[PDB]
Design a protein around this nucleic acid. Structure first.
Ligand SMILES: [Mg+2]
Ligand SMILES: [Mg+2]
Ligand SMILES: [Mg+2]
Ligand SMILES: [Mg+2]
Ligand SMILES: [Mg+2]
Ligand SMILES: [Mg+2]
Ligand SMILES: [Mg+2]
Ligand SMILES: [Mg+2]
Ligand SMILES: [Mg+2]
Ligand SMILES: [Mg+2]
Ligand SMILES: [Mg+2]
Ligand SMILES: [Mg+2]
Ligand SMILES: [Mg+2]
Ligand SMILES: [Mg+2]
Ligand SMILES: [Mg+2]
Lengths: 324, 118, 138, 168, 177, 52
RNA sequence: AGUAUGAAAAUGAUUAUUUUAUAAGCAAUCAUGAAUAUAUUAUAUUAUAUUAAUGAUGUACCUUUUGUAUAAUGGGUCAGC
RNA sequence: AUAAUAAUAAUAUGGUAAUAGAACAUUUAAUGAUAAUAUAUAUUAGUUAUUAAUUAAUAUAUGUAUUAAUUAAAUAGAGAA
């Protein structure tokens, strides 16, 4: 006999299992099972599907393997099947995230500016955030080599359970990164995995319970804290407020001193209110008068934009951003 | 009890009491009880019962304790744990014996999942 | 004119879907080594199976090493508790395992008096202001 | 001659060490450490040539030795590739050189002391105005940029614990 | 007044003037069970709260419009105008025709040092801002002005530059909310 | 001598007791075998070049 | 008083971070801002670590005594015994 | 009719001189797997109700613990002469 032959046949078996993701093997994988139990995924979502979601596309081994001298070696993963990876799933998950999150944000804040809305959406479902979520869930990367695994003589089940992409061995050894594309990044792979899981959930539940996916998203993605007030940065807000007042049936906004203390000091306090008629729109405190005025305008704009109506109200469609 | 303004308001706080210890909370807030919970395991949900005060920005319902029907307040038990281990030394002023008073009290991290006017 | 500030969301584990903090536990023992007796007994005696049945979201690795017997947990936040269970009986080991599973992974920390609630949320009522107080000072 | 991009990850210590420097060392100088300090504190962050000039016109005995050391460090820097008008003394310290021979001083009325005879060494690290100084200027600039301003009516943390109750 | 709830201060059992920070007194103070009106002791600057938003910014079908919580405590008659433009005090005027505008533009290009914005404003009974909106100066003049500004900046000490930076940071912070 | 099958709850498993020395020996044999294979191929290529 | 090795401490000089030129006492502890550093799950409104803003409490240790902050005993510091 | 662990109710838990019970560190002797993917020592940060040990990183040594554990013993623990 020969040990090379033994290793080779093991590798071939592993490749075959990757191509298939046979259901029994996937079921045997403890990590997959624990992930399934942790997230409370549907029973219709098979363990093979879950394994597939963790399998990123990796058809051909790249040219950068040829030289570890240039700071890269791809020796962990094994080639995947063209029609059994997380790629199609991932896209679907991304689409779902882009639809649902955005919709939820619009429901919450129907006048939110376009740029601000986009930023909020990004915050909710940015690649880094998605990667973090995946890590939290316990989607671990297949860092160990194939040869090493063979030597240890571990089953293929464990491999199936781990996340599988062209992860560069010696990525940041001796403090040297190679700056490769998105197809070799860990964060991206983790993002794909979390999107792929969502897509798989959608696939299994859509006919029985159409909104199951969206309630899962709400539980995991939309449950996260984001203060929308911290997102804004105005420029000349008084002018913008005046424009808004003009657009609506409101009197011209003027700022007026409500209260004042410590004028002729290092740190005064000036309270000014931007009135439109007798109604106050924005209240603004400040060290200077100018500052206070600015703050009142910004407050007014916040109140305009971040207005969140009740669920009992009929839908509020805003009349666009205030084009100054 | 006309509880309409509270119901309307987007922001809302509660001052529920566990063993007469008040904890002022909103939804998402992460309460740290200074004892080991025996009844609930980790993952279990706690329906708060002795809710003293339920407040908006300008109004507050108060009751001893507020009708359970009027509100919901679900905490989740998100980890039993402990405080950091400390060893203060106890000794008298011309005495070489120095008794070490070791201490490492228990904690229970709750998370206020739901808080709303029913 | 209005511009966004790039900002990211904060995950509150409990509020939507509770992800269980403890993700993996490794039982480590030695075949030699008299300190690993209680651990070995625990591994043998149908308790581990029951445990796994109870908690199917935790994976239970069982390893053999030359040193003292070890219980290393692994949590969602990425931290790792490792308890050496040298010379402990079966029941003590089980208690230790229970303690580990109970833990949210976070580091141990001194709390001051009444440092109870930890909010991301802005106050429902505002912050106090002397100009806006009900009773004016003198 | 390559299309491979890279990003380098270096500790603070690694950054410090890799900047071009030169390490002068004296021989076994006959002096006290205190006496050396009394001079060496003057030659803190000077340009090497300035320091050498100061040593030349100093009244002290260690001064000549210090000057010689500086000259040697300059020569070393030149040999390496550096310039003498670029070099500044980054660090310069002293230390005991060991094996100080004690020797009893006999006093009046059957009393004694012990006279030690101290030997020291001066080492110094010369660094470049062209790199190290530029780097620390850049760091200072970054720190200045980072620095949050003084706000007059600014958001200071309401220090103290809440106590499970609104006080407003 | 829609609601007729009794109103309460944030009451301590202790002397509030001497022990406002003492949480214990607040904890002690029990009040009879029911609904109350505790008006907030706060400015409504950073608040997105629904009790803080004005009625004009609420939607027409909002139930909250009718409820009396965006309280108009202040009065615009009593408050005096702060950093208000002369157009706002005495109304906007749209009197200058195209010919006048063209003349202004011609003047400004010709000699911005002689025919400055303020002078134009004085001549035509209109704002300096409006003059600016109407007409660009000769780009040379602008360049000169920029150079002068740069020279002034250079003339500063280190401290002054830092102070200016701090001021700029503060200004940026104002518009955050 | 526990195994993954012994526990009968699929989240429990026992990692394989393969001695470090044995693994090292296996590695040595495989890399050596590869080297042998390569060297023979290179020799053959040299012979072919020499021929024509 | 063997030979190698020696980031053991006391001790000296130097550099870095941080605090410090209107503040008074075992130099610590607890509260609590700020600044800096590290952090291949800081997702952050993050976590740890270092540091005499500021506040509160705080009469070295042993021995011997009815009783010691005592201005009663004894100790210059660390290492080995 | 025991032991270990966990519940509930009750009572008790300041301590000089003193009495009693239970542990740990260190060194040697008896028995004794294992191994540079290991062991030992040090530093830093975690972990276990913590004089102790353990995890990780880093450093230096060593082809390796008279190692875990149970016994037997002691030139067996030092801010106090
Ligand atoms: Mg006494
Ligand atoms: Mg004492
Ligand atoms: Mg020597
Ligand atoms: Mg004499
Ligand atoms: Mg002397
Ligand atoms: Mg008082
Ligand atoms: Mg001062
Ligand atoms: Mg003094
Ligand atoms: Mg005295
Ligand atoms: Mg004395
Ligand atoms: Mg003395
Ligand atoms: Mg006692
Ligand atoms: Mg002894
Ligand atoms: Mg000693
Ligand atoms: Mg002692």
């Amino acid at each position: 006999e020969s040990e090379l032959a033994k290793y080779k046949e093991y590798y071939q078996g592993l490749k075959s299992t990757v191509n298939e993701i046979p259901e029994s093997v996937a079921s045997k994988s403890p990590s997959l099972r624990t992930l399934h139990k942790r997230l409370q995924l549907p029973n219709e979502l098979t363990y093979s599907t879950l394994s597939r979601c963790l399998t990123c596309p990796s058809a051909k081994l790249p040219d950068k393997i040829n030289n570890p001298t240039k700071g890269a070696a791809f020796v962990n993963t094994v080639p995947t099947n063209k029609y059994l990876d997380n790629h199609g799933l991932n896209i679907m998950g991304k689409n779902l995230l882009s639809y649902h999150v955005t919709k939820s944000i619009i429901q919450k804040y129907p006048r939110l500016p376009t740029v601000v809305l986009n930023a909020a959406v990004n915050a909710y479902i940015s690649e880094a955030v998605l990667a973090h979520i995946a890590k939290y869930w316990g989607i671990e990367v297949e860092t160990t080599s194939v040869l090493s695994r063979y030597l240890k003589m571990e089953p293929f089940e464990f491999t199936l359970g781990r996340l599988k992409f062209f992860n560069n061995s010696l990525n940041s050894k001796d403090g040297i990164e190679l700056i490769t594309g998105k197809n070799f990044s860990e964060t991206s792979a983790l993002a794909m995995s979390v999107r792929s899981i969502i897509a798989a959930i959608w696939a299994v539940t859509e006919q029985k319970d159409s909104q199951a996916v969206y309630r899962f998203i709400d539980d995991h993605i939309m449950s996260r804290k984001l203060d929308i007030t911290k997102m804004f940065q105005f420029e000349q807000p008084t002018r913008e407020l005046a424009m808004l007042c003009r657009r609506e049936g409101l009197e011209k906004p003027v700022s007026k001193l409500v209260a004042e203390s410590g004028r002729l000091s290092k740190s005064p306090v000036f309270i000014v209110h931007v009135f439109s008629g007798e109604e106050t729109l924005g209240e603004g405190y400040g060290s200077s008068l100018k500052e206070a005025k600015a703050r009142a305008a910004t407050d007014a704009l916040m109140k305009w934009y971040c207005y969140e109506p009740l669920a009992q109200q009929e839908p509020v469609i805003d009349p666009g951003t205030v084009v100054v | 009890t006309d509880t309409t303004p509270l119901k309307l308001s987007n922001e809302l706080y509660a001052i529920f009491k566990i063993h007469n210890r008040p904890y002022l909370v909103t939804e998402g807030d992460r309460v740290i009880l200074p004892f080991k919970l025996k009844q609930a395991e980790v993952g279990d949900i706690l329906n708060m019962t002795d809710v003293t005060t339920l407040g908006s920005r300008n109004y507050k319902l108060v009751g001893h304790p507020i009708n359970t029907s009027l509100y919901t307040l679900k905490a989740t038990v998100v980890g039993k744990t402990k405080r950091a281990f400390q060893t203060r030394e106890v000794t008298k002023r011309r005495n070489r014996r120095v008794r070490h008073a070791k201490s490492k009290g228990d904690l229970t991290i709750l998370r206020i999942s739901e808080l709303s006017m029913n | 004119v209005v511009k966004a500030i790039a900002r990211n969301s904060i995950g509150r584990n409990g509020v939507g879907a509770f992800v269980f903090p403890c993700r993996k536990i490794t039982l480590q023992f030695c075949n030699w080594g008299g300190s690993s007796e209680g651990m070995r007994k625990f591994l043998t005696s149908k308790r581990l199976d029951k445990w796994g049945q109870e908690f199917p979201w935790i994976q239970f690795e069982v390893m053999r090493k030359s040193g003292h017997p070890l219980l290393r947990a692994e949590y969602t936040n990425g931290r790792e508790k490792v308890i050496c269970v040298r010379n402990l009986n079966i029941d003590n080991v089980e208690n230790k395992l229970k303690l580990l599973k109970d833990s949210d992974g976070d580091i141990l920390r001194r709390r001051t008096k009444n440092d109870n609630v930890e909010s991301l949320n802005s106050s429902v009522r505002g912050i106090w202001s002397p100009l806006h107080a009900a009773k004016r000072h003198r | 001659n390559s299309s491979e991009r890279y990003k380098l990850k270096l500790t603070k210590r690694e950054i410090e060490v890799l900047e071009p420097s030169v390490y002068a060392q004296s021989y076994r100088i006959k002096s006290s450490m205190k006496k050396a300090t009394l001079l060496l504190r003057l030659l803190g962050g000077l340009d090497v040539m300035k320091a050498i000039s100061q040593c030349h016109f100093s009244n002290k005995k260690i001064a000549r030795e210090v000057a010689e050391l500086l000259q040697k460090g300059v020569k070393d820097g030149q040999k390496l590739g550096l310039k003498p008008e670029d070099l500044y003394i980054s660090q310069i310290w002293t230390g005991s050189d060991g094996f100080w021979r004690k020797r009893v001083e006999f006093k009046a009325r059957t009393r004694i002391g012990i006279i030690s005879h101290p030997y020291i060494h001066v080492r110094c690290i010369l660094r470049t105005k062209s790199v190290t100084k530029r780097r620390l200027a850049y760091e200072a600039h970054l720190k200045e940029q980072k620095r949050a301003p003084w706000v007059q009516l600014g958001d200071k943390p309401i220090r103290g614990v809440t106590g499970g109750v609104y006080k407003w | 007044k829609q609601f007729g709830f009794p109103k309460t201060q944030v009451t301590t059992i202790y002397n509030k003037t001497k022990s406002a920070s003492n949480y214990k007194g607040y904890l002690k103070h029990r009040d009879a069970p029911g609904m109350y009106y505790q008006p907030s002791e706060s400015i409504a600057t950073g608040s997105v709260n629904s009790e803080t938003i004005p009625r004009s910014f609420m939607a027409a079908s909002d139930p909250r419009r009718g409820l009396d919580m965006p309280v108009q405590s202040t009065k615009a008659k009593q408050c005096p105008n702060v950093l208000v433009g002369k157009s706002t005090v005495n109304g906007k005027t749209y009197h200058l025709g195209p010919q006048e505008i063209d003349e202004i533009r011609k003047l400004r290009l010709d000699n911005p040092q002689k025919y400055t914005r303020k002078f134009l404003a004085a001549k035509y009974g209109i704002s300096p801002l409006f003059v600016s909106m109407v007409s660009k100066p000769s780009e040379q003049h602008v360049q000169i002005m920029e150079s002068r500004l740069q020279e002034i900046q250079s003339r500063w000490k280190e401290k002054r530059r830092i102070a200016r930076e701090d001021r700029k940071r503060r200004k940026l912070l104002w518009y955050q909310a | 001598h526990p195994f993954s099958d012994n526990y009968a709850s699929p989240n429990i498993y026992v990692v394989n007791d393969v001695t470090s020395k044995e693994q090292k020996s296996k590695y040595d044999t495989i890399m050596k075998e590869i080297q042998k294979l390569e060297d023979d191929a290179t020799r053959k290529a040299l012979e072919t070049a020499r021929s024509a």
